[PDB]
Design goal:
2 copies of one chain form a homodimer. Chain A folds into 2 domains: about 130 residues, 3-Layer(aba) Sandwich (Rossmann fold); about 40 residues, Orthogonal Bundle (Ribonucleotide Reductase Protein R1, domain 1). In chain A, strands 3-2-1-4-5-6 form a 6-stranded parallel sheet. In chain A, about 30% of the residues lie in helices and about 15% in strands. Chain A has 6 helices and 6 strands, in the order E-H-H-H-E-H-E-E-H-E-E-H. Chain A is an alpha/beta fold. The interface between A and B is medium-sized, with 21 and 24 residues. Bound molecules: chloride ion (2 copies) and magnesium ion (2 copies). Chain A: Its cofactor is Mg(2+). Chain A: Dephosphorylates the 5' and 2'(3')-phosphates of deoxyribonucleotides. Chain A: Keywords: Hydrolase, Magnesium, Metal-binding.
Amino acid sequence: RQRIAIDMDEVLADTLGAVVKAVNERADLNIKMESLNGKKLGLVMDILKEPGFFRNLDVMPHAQEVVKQLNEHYDIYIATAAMDVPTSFHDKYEWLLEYFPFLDPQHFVFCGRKNIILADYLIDDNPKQLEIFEGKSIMFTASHNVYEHRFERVSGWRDVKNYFNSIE
Amino acid sequence: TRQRIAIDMDEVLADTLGAVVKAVNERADLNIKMESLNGKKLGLVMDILKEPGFFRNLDVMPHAQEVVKQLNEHYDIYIATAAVPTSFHDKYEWLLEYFPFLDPQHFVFCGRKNIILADYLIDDNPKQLEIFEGKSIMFTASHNVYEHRFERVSGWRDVKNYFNSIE
Ligand SMILES: [Cl-]
Ligand SMILES: [Cl-]
Ligand SMILES: [Mg+2]
Ligand SMILES: [Mg+2]
């Protein structure tokens, strides 16, 4: 029975959509999502560090239904940065409890470098974690990584379900 | 490539039990002896543990800074702990203060250490040691003195002697 580790930001949670929305509201801009392809987005840091920010994020389309399915055959762990935005440790945990209530809360791990994670698969948007992970790395598409080619790529949660269906 | 050692915080890097005993003695005016705690784990203990700053103020286990720094010459070092409202902040600040040579990207907050990919785990809790998939190294604590399944080290100069012996 194999183990899949899943990153939170830009994979399970729509962290980028939330930041852009807040920036557009506050600084009165019209940043389009497309314009961030291959790129990374002061006010932003302050948006990310506001209490509740990680609590209020949207779930990525189809992520709940797909992860609930994968959980029938795979052990699921959720992995996320701790020292990135220290003050949001609790909000992230509470978001996972709200939106992924069917997962064992003991399977939530906070770490920097995900090479410490013992699992067969890692679903992550960050190439820097995909390159160091010691299982099979699966790259979840995000605007910043659209020009990366080294890793097996999945664009969305339906793509995730299809990948796992193909190796079973 | 470097091999990796995962190290637990409480009762391994940090003298958590010394702190709790001290606090209990002061408050309940007791004189609990450690020799009374062999095999034992010990509402006001929870209250002591949950006071903001408790984990920030722990003493470092003798020789831990020196031996972990030396081990870091040859092995990548990860710190694993559960983290308890202010405990996350207090623990990380404590590591930054007392172990500044360690990389914070290697701090791991989890409940069950079966998720950790490392060659070695140094931990006092036999429940963690039993589920770890690397080499489990038991660090001696009052509560574990009758556990015999795992390789035992008593103190950090003994941990150094263990790693020296395999080199
Ligand atoms: Cl938490
Ligand atoms: Cl690798
Ligand atoms: Mg991410
Ligand atoms: Mg411990």
